[PDB]
């Protein structure tokens, strides 16, 4: 019983129109939009009750609008995106019209507004096989996944073992590092580890895969450069079990 | 109009207790909300504080409310790594809109058992030269610092939990596109224990 | 003219104070047109349906723990709080009365005239207005209009005395009100 | 013994709403529905106290919704019109040339909709004309005050014309110097 938000992430050019979608909790009476610029506080934008705007922010009203398409969906529209509009957009809902209850938040939509779409680059993904020295010393095996040269930030790295996503024995960096820190639009790097028992890695019937979900250019954007279009894609790398 | 949280960041060892504060306006008070916001997850509602001097408990987490002075305290008892999150407080006036504080980013340092500090070299499944150096099995007191050299990239310490094998371990990754680069010099900027295993 | 049917949703949130703030009785009342259908009385602790129309709201609002908790705490968080906000300009509001004594008609003596004692623009409503023949309290033949709200935080009272005057008559109006320390008097001569 | 009343309503098809605070029969403040701001009965109250108009605005939206729910529940039963009682009096005893205020008191009526016009020598007057909102009553009927600052003269005749759906024809309450 939770608030749903689509898409998870969005990348658009400055001056373009964005439509953020939300599925509030079915029986809830109040709907809200909140936003958080990275490094800033969670800020109120707008509240909605009985087909009308209750409260609105100073950030809202100017080229900002909300819509109720049906009795299930709620949307936020930014007519002309600005660089300052780059934030995590949260949709919220509360059951009571009286307001003496908790506000349920959506997963959020990470919106990145860029001046130029040429800065956008997909990641390069590589899997690094566990050291045999580690197997001989601890009887454990750790694989390392490296996602490099991506712009913009906020990718989704996941490990897949024998066709199923794993979380146990996995640890990914909570923040990516800058390849060229002396740059405004620097390409990012991210790492992750998957630790298994040596017996599990030695089995050649076991398959290991590292997935990186990248969010870039849309299927209605301007791409005039030589290199491939940096669209929303899944860049992958793999490794099979080795006895050795 | 304005809400403030103290401290901005907080580090606590597994099993030890902590607390942090939230300051809100004393005028036109209706409610004070607490949210737990874990990294990849959405903010989860913890408490709704309305009554002065009333204390609510949600497992090992406790919250106090003082309306006249305009302060709220959140208590975490026997901190678990699962408690690592950004804890946000929000003030509600006569309407519905929430005024948020800056939050208290809580990091629970886990209990590292059976340490075996070592630096290993990992080769690419596609090849070549660009290999990774993994500093693993060190204790929570050992800290990993920045690279200092632009051509070398070092990631911060990260804890993995082998849930089925009830084991936790620390790790940091180092990589570079250099012929000279080796795992022996890779973690120079940080204080590595003398007992660190460098394989032959 | 406009003969269209009308539909009214009316609500009152009442705070009744006794012995200052020592006793507070809170009532949250809901009305559809002229009919009361549901109410929350702080003496009962929950919502109760007044008519059969208020039954869905009774069971629904009592099931909503956050809304019910808000009502059970209203005596202190709402009632006692708002009393304190107003107190100085509300409970402590004091306006001295303007007392004017005049005859209703310019009729000659030995006949009849109504002596009017006008007490206007005062606050609070607590007032005691008395008529005196010369120095003796005249209880019979006193026509009062009672307490009148002016709707601008002031009151007024018109207390009249049935008079049959003769040569040397001195009628006096005595007014005692919480705003005045000494009860102010106004004398009238034939 | 004191009474603090929060009075609120919403009426259809008129689309008229109201939110006000009352202390012992007197209005503390009301919220202007069009301007969306707190309107204190006496200007000084705005210095001694504060109020968030949004709390009132959120309640009006709920009453608007509840009116729809209640009409449908009652099988679309309308209000019975209760005609008002009209009284005209002065602020203080009347004296020629000496400034005074004519008070038109409208009482014991429902629904809370009334058309009030001041008539001096049969002509409508608007100069300095102030009015209160619909005030609450113990029997759940309404009260209303209308004011007219005036210069008392033997030349002028005054009237308070009151229009209500419970009246057969517009009610006129006469006042003249005597």
């Amino acid at each position: 019983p939770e608030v749903t938000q689509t898409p998870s992430h969005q990348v658009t050019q400055m001056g373009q129109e964005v439509i953020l979608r939300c599925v509030p909790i079915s029986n809830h009476l109040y709907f809200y939009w909140y936003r958080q610029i990275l490094g800033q506080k969670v800020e109120f934008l707008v509240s909605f009750y009985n087909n009308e705007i209750s409260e609105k922010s100073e950030i809202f009203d100017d080229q900002f609008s909300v819509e109720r398409p049906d009795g299930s969906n709620f949307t936020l529209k930014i007519r002309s995106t600005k660089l300052e509009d780059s934030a995590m957009y949260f949709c919220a809902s509360s059951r009571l019209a009286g307001g003496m209850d908790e506000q349920f938040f959506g997963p959020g939509t990470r919106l990145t507004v860029l001046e130029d779409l040429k800065n956008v680059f997909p990641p390069e993904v590589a899997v690094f096989e566990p050291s045999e020295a580690e197997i001989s010393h601890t009887q454990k095996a750790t694989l390392v996944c490296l996602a490099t040269g991506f712009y913009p930030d906020h990718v989704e790295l996941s490990w897949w073992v024998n066709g199923k996503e794993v979380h146990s024995g996995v640890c990914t960096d909570p923040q990516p590092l800058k390849e060229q820190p002396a740059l405004n639009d620097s390409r990012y790097a991210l790492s992750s580890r998957l630790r298994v028992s040596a017996t599990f890695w030695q089995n050649p019937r076991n398959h290991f895969r590292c997935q990186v979900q990248f969010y870039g250019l849309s299927e209605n954007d301007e791409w005039t450069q030589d290199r491939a279009k940096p669209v929303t894609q899944i860049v992958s790398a793999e490794a099979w079990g080795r006895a050795d | 109009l304005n809400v403030e949280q103290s401290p901005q960041s907080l580090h606590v060892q597994e099993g030890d207790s902590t607390n942090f504060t939230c300051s809100f306006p004393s005028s036109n008070f209706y409610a004070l909300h607490w949210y737990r916001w874990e990294t990849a997850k959405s903010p989860e509602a913890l408490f709704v504080m309305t009554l002065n001097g009333d204390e609510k408990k949600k497992g090992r987490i406790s919250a106090t409310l003082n309306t006249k002075e305009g302060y709220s305290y959140l208590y975490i008892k026997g901190s678990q790594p699962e408690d690592s999150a950004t804890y946000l407080c929000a003030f509600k006036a006569a309407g519905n809109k929430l005024t948020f504080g800056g939050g208290t980013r809580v990091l629970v340092k886990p209990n590292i058992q059976n340490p075996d500090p070592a630096v290993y070299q990992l080769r690419d499944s596609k090849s070549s030269d660009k290999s990774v150096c993994l500093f693993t099995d060190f204790d929570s007191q050992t800290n990993v610092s920045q690279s200092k050299d632009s051509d070398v990239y070092i990631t911060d310490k990260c804890v993995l939990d082998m849930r089925s094998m009830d084991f936790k371990s620390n790790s940091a990754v180092a990589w570079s596109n250099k012929s000279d680069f080796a795992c022996a010099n890779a973690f120079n900027n940080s204080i590595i224990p003398e007992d660190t295993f460098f394989p032959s | 003219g406009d003969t269209r049917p009308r539909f009214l949703e009316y609500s009152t949130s009442e705070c009744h104070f006794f012995n200052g703030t020592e006793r507070v009785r809170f009532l949250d009342r809901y009305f559809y047109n002229q009919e009361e259908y549901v109410r929350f009385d702080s003496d009962v602790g929950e919502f109760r349906a007044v008519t059969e129309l208020g039954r869905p709201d009774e069971e629904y609002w009592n099931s909503q723990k956050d809304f019910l908790e808000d009502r059970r705490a209203a005596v202190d968080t709402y009632c006692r709080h708002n009393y304190g906000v107003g107190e100085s300009f509300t409970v402590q509001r004091r306006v001295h009365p303007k007392v004017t004594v005049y005859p209703s008609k310019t009729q000659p003596l030995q006949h009849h005239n109504l002596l009017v004692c006008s007490v206007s623009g005062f606050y609070p409503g607590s007032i005691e207005v008395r008529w005196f023949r010369n120095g003796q309290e005249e209880k019979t033949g006193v026509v009062s209009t009672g307490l009148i709200h002016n709707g601008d935080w002031t009151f007024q009272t018109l207390v009249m005395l049935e008079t049959v005057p003769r040569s040397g008559e001195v009628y006096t109006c005595q007014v005692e009100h919480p705003s005045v320390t000494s009860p102010l008097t106004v004398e009238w001569r034939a | 013994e004191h009474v603090i009343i929060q009075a609120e309503f919403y009426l259809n098809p008129d689309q008229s709403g109201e939110f006000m605070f009352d202390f012992d029969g007197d209005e503390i403040f009301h919220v202007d529905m069009a301007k969306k701001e707190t309107v204190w009965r006496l200007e000084e109250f705005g210095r001694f106290a504060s109020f968030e108009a949004q709390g009132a605005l959120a309640n009006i939206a709920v009453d608007k919704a509840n009116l729809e729910i209640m009409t449908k529940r009652s099988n679309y039963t309308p209000i019975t019109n209760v005609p008002p009682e009209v009284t005209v009096l002065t602020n203080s005893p009347v004296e020629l040339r000496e400034p005074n205020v004519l008070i038109c008191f409208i009482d014991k009526f429902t629904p809370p909709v009334v058309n009030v016009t001041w008539l001096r020598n049969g002509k409508p007057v608007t100069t300095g004309v102030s009015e209160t909102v619909f005030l609450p009553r113990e029997d759940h009927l309404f009260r209303k005050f209308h004011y007219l600052p005036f210069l008392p003269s033997t030349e002028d005749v005054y009237d308070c014309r009151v229009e209500h759906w419970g009246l057969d024809e517009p009610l006129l309450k006469h006042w003249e110097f005597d």
């Binding site: - | 036109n28 | - | 709390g55 729910i69």
Partner: peptide
């Protein structure tokens, strides 16, 4: 100091 509105809840549909 502020006067506090007693917040109203939506009726049972």
């Amino acid at each position: 100091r502020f006067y506090k509105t007693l917040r109203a809840e939506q009726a049972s549909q």
